[PDB]
Amino acid sequence: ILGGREAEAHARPYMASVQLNGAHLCGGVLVAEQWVLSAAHCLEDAADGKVQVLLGAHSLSQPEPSKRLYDVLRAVPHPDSQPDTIDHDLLLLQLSEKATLGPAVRPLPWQRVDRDVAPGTLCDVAGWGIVNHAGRRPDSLQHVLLPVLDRATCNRRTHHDGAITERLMCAESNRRDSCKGDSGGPLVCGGVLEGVVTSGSRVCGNRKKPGIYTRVASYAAWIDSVLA
Numbered sequence: 001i002l003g004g005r006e007a008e009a010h011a012r013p014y015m016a017s018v019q020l021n022g023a024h025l026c027g028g029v030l031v032a033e034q035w036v037l038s039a040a041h042c043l044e045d046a047a048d049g050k051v052q053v054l055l056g057a058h059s060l061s062q063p064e065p066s067k068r069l070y071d072v073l074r075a076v077p078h079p080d081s082q083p084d085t086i087d088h089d090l091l092l093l094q095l096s097e098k099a100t101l102g103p104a105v106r107p108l109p110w111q112r113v114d115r116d117v118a119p120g121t122l123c124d125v126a127g128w129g130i131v132n133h134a135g136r137r138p139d140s141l142q143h144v145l146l147p148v149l150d151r152a153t154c155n156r157r158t159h160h161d162g163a164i165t166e167r168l169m170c171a172e173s174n175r176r177d178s179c180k181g182d183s184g185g186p187l188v189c190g191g192v193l194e195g196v197v198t199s200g201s202r203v204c205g206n207r208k209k210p211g212i213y214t215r216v217a218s219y220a221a222w223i224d225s226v227l228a
């Protein structure tokens, strides 16, 4: 996250770190007792390595009582996703057992009503992604509050030039922004999961190039089918 602040520890008990060989790779969101939602392309370069999900964390490195690193039984990228597109950019990870729940580990309710938010709606995005142009990596979870940017503006030739389908949404990116390593993490509005940070490399913090997030409501049937 560019331009953000250190999150209150454990105040987002849904927040997950998706890891490859014990290193943070992507954000994710606990959406059911045994399932974490993330971004499709998070595991693009993984097959030779161990995929795990860290729940209950604030610091990536320090011991905390609620921190637990779960193994993954199965990874389910969206079957329509393709490398080098932004569409269908969702991933479901089934943990090796149900997560132990408590004040610091809890699933987030997620949006099933497929309608847009009001422009300007203030949403929260959190992550352990880079925090500056030099690529500095935070030990602890960061966050930013971002207004939603209307799709028409987001689609103009100067911005994302027609690439924002009805299945995607945008948030402003003026200095405050998601960036590398925040892929897969949650965009939360009104205490409900609305979006998932996209995987595609994209420039960070340029107001002219808004953040892109996959709308979870647009994929409710897929999520339900996999979860079941």
Ligand SMILES: NC(=O)n1cc(NC(=O)N2[C@@H]3C[C@@H]3C[C@H]2C(=O)Nc2cccc(OC(F)(F)F)c2)c2ccccc21
Binding pocket: 024, 025, 026, 039, 041, 042, 043, 044, 128, 129, 130, 137, 138, 178, 179, 180, 181, 182, 183, 197, 198, 199, 200, 201, 202, 203, 204, 212
């Ligand atoms: N939406 C948004 O703005 N963005 C999303 C990006 N996608 C990623 O980030 N990755 C894609 C999903 C894979 C793995 C993952 C990754 O590289 N993860 C990664 C790799 C190396 C280290 C790392 O840790 C840390 F801390 F640096 F983030 C994460 C991204 C990259 C550059 C610019 C913008 C970016």
